[PDB]
Amino acid sequence: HWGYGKHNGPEHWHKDFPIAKGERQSPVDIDTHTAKYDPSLKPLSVSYDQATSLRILNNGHAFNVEFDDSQDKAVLKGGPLDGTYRLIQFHFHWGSLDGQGSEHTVDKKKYAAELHLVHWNTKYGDFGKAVQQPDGLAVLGIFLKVGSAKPGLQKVVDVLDSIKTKGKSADFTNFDPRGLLPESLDYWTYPGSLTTPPLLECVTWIVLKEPISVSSEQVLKFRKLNFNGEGEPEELMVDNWRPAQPLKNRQIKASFK
Ligand SMILES: OC[C@H]1O[C@@H](O)[C@H](O)[C@@H](O)[C@@H]1O
Ligand SMILES: OC[C@H]1O[C@H](O)[C@H](O)[C@@H](O)[C@@H]1O
Ligand SMILES: NS(=O)(=O)c1ccccc1
Ligand SMILES: NS(=O)(=O)c1ccccc1
Ligand SMILES: [Zn+2]
């Protein structure tokens, strides 16, 4: 099954998921000089005040913090988006070392990690129907650099010891995802895909320009997670990122002049 190792990682995925070589795959390198300000973008609205987190799960690839998406609570609107997109989960991708870990790159520079807040377009009723649509999903991507600690991340860090291995989950109620955002909502946007199998080309990507800072100790705890299940040989959950894919017939737009 797919993973991030030498024998099942990104360079193998196309054999089961031929869309891996498709026309709008993610992530991509963001060439900041070629990205163009787009005056047609509307103001972006990240409305997370009523978010209801439920659970945190080690799925063998990353950990997902899951939300109640049975009503409009935490939603993303505006910017490049037509209509309302509901938060379903967030997760991260990270490296074995601070010099790698992000999926998107900025002028080829790799960040230590990248946070993905995943939302589905409510016009399609459910996530499963949304991933049959070209505009089914919106992912808000946020880079992580290592420096000062991110206070709003610490509750996540501290629960990871309870979900060390694949298939473990824990209650994770009353978590406020607003604490994971940077100050500025300046962003780049482009049409792309899921960055893990099934690699579906459903995503409007919104990648914030300003990274968040997390401490070395915080990211080191990400790196203590395991890809394997309980009782199996330990394989540290590190380097769970897909490298940049060809831009092909796309343009990256900037929200800022
Ligand atoms: O034809 C001109 C147009 O070319 C497009 O590729 C750009 O996205 C537009 O911003 C520009 O106005
Ligand atoms: O907010 C997420 C979680 O943070 C801490 O783990 C709290 O102890 C727990 O009650 C809460 O579910
Ligand atoms: N796509 S996958 O599951 O990573 C895969 C790996 C090796 C051979 C065929 C498929
Ligand atoms: N990593 S990603 O593109 O945010 C993603 C989101 C949901 C499912 C699969 C992948
Ligand atoms: Zn992701």
Coordinates of C-alpha atoms and ligand atoms in Angstrom, one line a residue:
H1 CA 0.0 0.0 0.0
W2 CA 1.1 3.5 -0.6
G3 CA 3.4 5.4 1.8
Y4 CA 6.5 7.5 1.9
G5 CA 9.3 4.8 1.9
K6 CA 11.7 4.0 -0.9
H7 CA 9.4 1.1 -2.1
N8 CA 6.0 2.7 -1.8
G9 CA 6.6 6.5 -1.8
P10 CA 5.7 9.3 -4.2
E11 CA 7.7 7.9 -7.2
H12 CA 5.6 4.7 -7.1
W13 CA 2.1 6.2 -6.6
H14 CA 1.4 6.5 -10.3
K15 CA 1.2 2.7 -10.7
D16 CA -2.0 2.5 -8.6
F17 CA -3.1 6.2 -9.0
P18 CA -2.3 7.2 -12.6
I19 CA -3.7 10.7 -12.0
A20 CA -0.3 11.2 -10.2
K21 CA 1.0 12.3 -13.6
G22 CA -2.1 14.5 -14.2
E23 CA -2.6 18.1 -15.3
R24 CA -3.2 19.7 -12.0
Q25 CA -1.2 17.9 -9.3
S26 CA -0.1 19.3 -6.0
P27 CA 2.0 20.4 -4.4
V28 CA 3.9 22.9 -6.6
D29 CA 6.7 25.3 -6.2
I30 CA 5.4 28.8 -5.8
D31 CA 7.6 31.1 -7.9
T32 CA 6.9 34.4 -6.1
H33 CA 8.2 36.5 -9.0
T34 CA 5.9 34.9 -11.6
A35 CA 2.8 34.8 -9.3
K36 CA 0.5 37.8 -10.2
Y37 CA -1.7 39.9 -8.0
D38 CA -5.3 39.2 -8.9
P39 CA -7.8 42.1 -8.2
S40 CA -10.7 39.7 -8.9
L41 CA -10.1 37.8 -5.6
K42 CA -12.6 38.8 -3.0
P43 CA -11.7 39.2 0.7
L44 CA -10.8 35.8 2.3
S45 CA -12.9 34.9 5.3
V46 CA -11.7 32.2 7.8
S47 CA -14.6 31.8 10.2
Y48 CA -13.5 29.3 12.9
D49 CA -15.2 30.8 16.0
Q50 CA -17.8 28.0 16.3
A51 CA -15.5 25.1 15.3
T52 CA -16.2 21.8 17.1
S53 CA -13.2 19.5 17.1
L54 CA -13.9 15.9 18.0
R55 CA -11.0 13.5 17.7
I56 CA -7.3 13.1 16.7
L57 CA -6.3 10.0 14.7
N58 CA -3.0 8.5 13.6
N59 CA -3.9 7.1 10.2
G60 CA -0.5 5.7 9.4
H61 CA 0.4 8.6 7.1
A62 CA -0.1 11.7 9.4
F63 CA -2.4 12.6 12.3
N64 CA -5.8 14.2 11.6
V65 CA -7.7 16.4 13.9
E66 CA -11.3 15.9 12.9
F67 CA -14.2 18.3 13.2
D68 CA -18.0 18.1 13.3
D69 CA -19.0 19.1 9.7
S70 CA -22.7 18.3 10.1
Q71 CA -23.5 22.1 10.0
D72 CA -21.8 25.3 9.0
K73 CA -19.6 26.0 12.0
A74 CA -15.9 26.4 10.9
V75 CA -16.0 27.6 7.3
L76 CA -13.8 29.2 4.7
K77 CA -15.3 31.7 2.2
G78 CA -14.2 34.4 -0.1
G79 CA -10.9 34.8 -1.9
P80 CA -11.0 32.6 -5.0
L81 CA -13.9 30.5 -3.6
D82 CA -17.5 30.4 -4.9
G83 CA -19.7 29.6 -1.9
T84 CA -19.1 28.1 1.5
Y85 CA -16.5 25.4 2.4
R86 CA -16.8 23.5 5.7
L87 CA -13.8 22.4 7.8
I88 CA -13.6 18.7 8.1
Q89 CA -10.0 18.0 9.4
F90 CA -6.5 19.3 9.6
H91 CA -3.2 17.5 9.5
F92 CA 0.5 18.3 8.9
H93 CA 3.4 17.1 6.7
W94 CA 6.9 17.3 8.2
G95 CA 10.5 16.3 7.8
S96 CA 13.2 14.3 9.5
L97 CA 15.2 17.5 9.8
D98 CA 14.2 21.2 10.0
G99 CA 15.5 21.8 6.4
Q100 CA 12.7 19.8 4.8
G101 CA 9.1 18.8 5.4
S102 CA 6.8 21.2 3.5
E103 CA 5.0 20.1 0.4
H104 CA 4.7 23.4 -1.3
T105 CA 7.9 25.4 -1.7
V106 CA 8.5 29.1 -2.1
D107 CA 11.1 29.9 -4.7
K108 CA 12.3 26.3 -4.1
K109 CA 12.7 26.9 -0.3
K110 CA 11.4 24.0 1.8
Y111 CA 9.9 24.8 5.2
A112 CA 10.1 22.4 8.3
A113 CA 6.4 21.5 8.0
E114 CA 3.1 22.4 6.4
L115 CA -0.4 22.5 8.0
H116 CA -3.4 21.6 5.8
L117 CA -6.9 22.7 6.9
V118 CA -9.2 20.7 4.7
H119 CA -12.7 22.0 3.7
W120 CA -15.4 20.8 1.4
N121 CA -17.9 22.7 -0.7
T122 CA -21.3 22.6 0.9
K123 CA -23.1 22.7 -2.5
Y124 CA -22.1 19.0 -2.9
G125 CA -23.6 17.8 0.4
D126 CA -20.8 15.5 1.7
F127 CA -17.0 15.2 1.4
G128 CA -17.4 12.0 -0.7
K129 CA -19.5 13.8 -3.3
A130 CA -17.2 16.9 -3.2
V131 CA -14.2 14.8 -4.3
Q132 CA -16.1 14.0 -7.5
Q133 CA -16.1 17.7 -8.4
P134 CA -13.4 20.1 -9.8
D135 CA -14.3 22.7 -7.1
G136 CA -15.1 20.2 -4.4
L137 CA -12.4 21.1 -1.8
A138 CA -10.4 24.0 -0.5
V139 CA -7.2 23.4 1.4
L140 CA -5.7 26.3 3.5
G141 CA -2.0 25.6 3.7
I142 CA 0.3 27.2 6.3
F143 CA 4.0 26.8 6.4
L144 CA 5.9 26.1 9.7
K145 CA 9.3 27.3 10.5
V146 CA 11.3 26.5 13.6
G147 CA 11.8 29.4 16.1
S148 CA 9.6 30.4 18.9
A149 CA 6.9 28.1 20.2
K150 CA 3.3 28.3 18.8
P151 CA 1.1 28.3 22.0
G152 CA -1.9 27.1 20.1
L153 CA -0.1 24.0 18.8
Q154 CA 0.9 22.7 22.3
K155 CA -2.4 20.9 23.0
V156 CA -1.8 18.9 19.7
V157 CA 1.8 18.2 20.6
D158 CA 0.9 16.9 24.1
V159 CA -1.7 14.4 22.9
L160 CA 0.6 12.7 20.4
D161 CA 2.1 10.3 22.9
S162 CA -1.4 8.8 23.1
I163 CA -1.7 8.1 19.4
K164 CA 1.8 7.0 18.7
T165 CA 0.9 4.2 16.3
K166 CA -1.3 3.7 13.2
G167 CA -4.9 3.2 14.1
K168 CA -4.9 4.9 17.5
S169 CA -7.2 7.8 18.2
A170 CA -8.0 10.0 21.2
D171 CA -10.7 12.5 22.1
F172 CA -9.7 16.0 21.0
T173 CA -12.7 18.2 21.8
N174 CA -12.6 21.9 22.5
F175 CA -9.6 22.6 20.3
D176 CA -9.5 26.1 18.7
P177 CA -7.9 26.0 15.2
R178 CA -7.7 29.8 15.2
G179 CA -4.5 29.3 17.3
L180 CA -2.7 27.8 14.3
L181 CA -3.0 30.8 12.0
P182 CA -0.4 33.5 11.4
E183 CA -1.3 37.2 11.7
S184 CA -1.6 37.9 8.0
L185 CA -4.0 36.2 5.6
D186 CA -2.0 37.2 2.5
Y187 CA -2.0 34.2 0.2
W188 CA -1.3 32.5 -3.1
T189 CA -3.9 30.4 -4.8
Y190 CA -4.0 27.9 -7.7
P191 CA -6.1 24.8 -8.7
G192 CA -4.6 21.5 -7.7
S193 CA -5.1 18.1 -6.1
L194 CA -4.9 16.1 -3.0
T195 CA -1.2 15.5 -2.2
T196 CA -1.8 11.9 -1.0
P197 CA -3.5 9.0 -2.9
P198 CA -6.1 9.1 -4.4
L199 CA -4.5 12.4 -5.6
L200 CA -7.9 13.7 -6.8
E201 CA -7.9 16.9 -8.8
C202 CA -10.6 18.7 -6.7
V203 CA -8.7 21.3 -4.7
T204 CA -8.5 25.0 -4.7
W205 CA -5.3 25.6 -2.8
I206 CA -4.9 28.7 -0.7
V207 CA -1.3 28.9 0.7
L208 CA -0.6 31.6 3.2
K209 CA 2.5 33.7 2.7
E210 CA 3.4 34.2 6.3
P211 CA 4.7 31.1 8.1
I212 CA 3.9 30.3 11.7
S213 CA 6.8 29.7 14.0
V214 CA 6.9 26.5 16.1
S215 CA 9.6 25.5 18.5
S216 CA 12.2 22.8 17.8
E217 CA 10.7 20.8 20.7
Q218 CA 7.2 20.9 19.2
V219 CA 8.3 19.5 15.8
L220 CA 10.6 17.0 17.5
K221 CA 7.4 15.5 19.0
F222 CA 5.8 15.2 15.6
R223 CA 8.9 13.1 14.7
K224 CA 8.3 10.6 17.5
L225 CA 5.1 9.4 15.9
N226 CA 5.1 6.0 14.1
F227 CA 3.9 5.0 10.7
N228 CA 3.6 1.4 11.9
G229 CA 0.9 -0.1 14.2
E230 CA 1.3 -1.2 17.7
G231 CA 3.6 -4.2 18.1
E232 CA 5.2 -3.8 14.7
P233 CA 8.8 -2.7 14.0
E234 CA 9.1 1.0 14.7
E235 CA 9.2 3.3 11.6
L236 CA 9.3 6.9 12.6
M237 CA 6.6 9.1 11.0
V238 CA 8.9 11.6 9.3
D239 CA 9.3 12.9 5.7
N240 CA 5.6 12.4 5.0
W241 CA 5.6 15.0 2.2
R242 CA 5.2 14.8 -1.6
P243 CA 7.7 16.8 -3.6
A244 CA 6.6 19.6 -5.9
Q245 CA 4.9 18.5 -9.1
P246 CA 4.9 20.1 -12.6
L247 CA 2.9 23.3 -12.8
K248 CA 1.8 22.6 -16.4
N249 CA -1.0 24.9 -17.7
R250 CA -1.6 26.8 -14.4
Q251 CA -1.0 30.2 -13.0
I252 CA -0.5 31.1 -9.3
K253 CA -2.4 34.2 -8.2
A254 CA -1.5 36.4 -5.3
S255 CA -4.0 38.1 -3.0
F256 CA -1.5 41.0 -2.3
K257 CA 0.0 43.7 -4.5
Ligands
LIG1 O1 -4.6 37.8 -21.9 C1 -4.2 38.5 -20.7 C2 -4.4 37.7 -19.5 O2 -3.5 36.5 -19.5 C3 -3.8 35.6 -18.4 O3 -2.9 34.5 -18.6 C4 -3.6 36.3 -17.1 O4 -4.0 35.4 -16.1 C5 -4.4 37.5 -17.0 O5 -4.1 38.2 -15.7 C6 -4.2 38.4 -18.2 O6 -5.0 39.6 -18.1
LIG2 O1 -8.5 20.8 23.0 C1 -7.9 19.6 22.7 C2 -7.6 18.8 24.0 O2 -6.6 19.5 24.7 C3 -6.1 18.9 25.8 O3 -5.6 17.6 25.5 C4 -7.2 18.8 26.9 O4 -6.7 18.1 28.0 C5 -8.3 18.0 26.3 O5 -9.4 18.0 27.2 C6 -8.8 18.6 24.9 O6 -9.7 17.7 24.3
LIG3 N1 0.7 3.3 -5.7 S1 1.4 2.4 -4.6 O1 0.4 1.7 -3.8 O2 2.4 3.2 -3.9 C1 2.3 1.1 -5.5 C2 3.6 0.8 -5.0 C3 4.3 -0.2 -5.8 C4 3.8 -0.8 -6.9 C5 2.5 -0.4 -7.3 C6 1.8 0.5 -6.6
LIG4 N1 -2.8 16.5 1.9 S1 -4.2 17.2 1.4 O1 -4.1 17.4 0.0 O2 -4.6 18.3 2.2 C1 -5.4 15.9 1.6 C2 -6.6 16.3 2.1 C3 -7.6 15.3 2.2 C4 -7.4 14.0 1.8 C5 -6.2 13.7 1.2 C6 -5.2 14.6 1.1
ZN5 ZN -2.0 17.4 3.4

